[PDB]
């Protein structure tokens, strides 16, 4: 009957898509966040221990 | 944004697009003498309501064949025992996280053979220590597992043996567009006309959101 | 520990999935993971492998990562009618200590 009356008809909503929940950035250390807000390297030191001697 | 020497330029965008059918029409049409009407023991308004049910029926049929078709194949072969059956249930719920398929609100339908084994003597919910409590032995209870709300089903589409499909809610969707019941005269004879059109459709929008066990059951 | 492994610890054979052998009924009816052994288990689809098990194991004191510049912007495009809307982020993380990281199929792809 109807050929070009009956419409077809597009959400107005897009589908976002499902993406991984992101986990790591809460589970690192983030300390070095308020040194790290002004050059391009931090420089990390280690204790080297005093050797035991008989 | 290093390895392009502190340049940028603009990418164009784009997207994807399902279509979505209203293309099933389904009806209901019987005839009722005035003569029957005032003859028989008592009321005959039990026909309409087995008209409706008749629609219902032919609509949770549908939507169920959509999800088995259309829905992706869970990998494994028929459960020898309950474990195993526990296991399909657990491995279509790690199948949809795979797809990164929302947590809250995933639904597994479960025929009655698929049922049977969450019912059975080897179930974690038919002994009192693998489940909290004695309600799955004493009243049959399936509460939930593994956060999914678990449902059964006779209008999935195999009936002897185990078929089920897990989803979230958000993965398939349906219209019904028409939904009309009406009483008319006959013209030839003294009787009422009941008749009621269903019109709808469905689509799984997205396939990776419903994963199905024994897709080709039948 | 990616999906895969996940999977494990809410199998028909976990501890997990039977209120006798853990604490509770909540691992089998919510699929509530929990804590085991002190360490707190979290589950992520961004480790490399999908499709065999793997999992790291860490202190967070082992490993740092900063973010330094955070930014969106929108303009009109030169070349066309458009906007044009472009972000920035700076950033930089070291395994700060490599013996408080453990890998479980490190080479998984």
């Keep these: 009957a109807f050929n070009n009356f009956i419409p077809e008809l597009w959400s107005d909503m897009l589908l976002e898509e499902w993406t991984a929940q992101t986990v790591f950035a809460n589970l690192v250390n983030r300390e070095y966040e308020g040194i790290a807000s002004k050059g391009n390297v931090v420089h990390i030191a280690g204790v080297v221990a005093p050797t035991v001697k008989d | ?218």
Excluded at chain 2, 6 to 24: E, K, M, N, Y
Excluded at chain 2, 117 to 129: F, I, N, Y
């Design chain 2, 1 to 218: 944004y290093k390895a392009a020497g502190r340049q940028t330029s603009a990418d164009a965008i784009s997207d994807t697009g399902v279509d979505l059918l209203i293309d099933q029409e389904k009806s209901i049409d019987f005839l009722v003498d005035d003569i029957d009407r005032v003859q028989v023991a008592g009321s005959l308004e039990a026909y309409t309501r087995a008209g409706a049910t008749a629609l219902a029926t032919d609509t949770d049929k549908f939507i169920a064949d959509m999800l088995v078709d259309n829905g992706t194949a869970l990998t494994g072969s028929a459960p020898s025992d309950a474990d195993d059956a526990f296991d399909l249930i657990a491995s279509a719920l790690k199948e949809l996280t795979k797809a990164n398929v929302p947590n809250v609100g995933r639904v597994v339908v479960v025929n009655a053979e698929m049922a049977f084994w969450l019912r059975s003597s080897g179930s974690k919910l038919t002994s009192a220590d693998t489940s909290g409590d004695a309600a799955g032995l004493r009243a049959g209870t399936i509460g939930n597992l593994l956060g999914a709300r678990i449902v059964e089903s006779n209008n999935l589409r195999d009936t002897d043996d185990e078929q089920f499909v897990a989803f979230h809610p958000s993965a398939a969707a349906y219209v019904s567009q028409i939904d009309t019941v009406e009483a008319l005269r006959d013209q030839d004879s003294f009787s009422d006309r009941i008749r009621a059109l269903h019109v709808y459709g469905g689509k799984v929008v997205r396939p990776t959101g419903v994963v199905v066990f024994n897709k080709t059951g039948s």
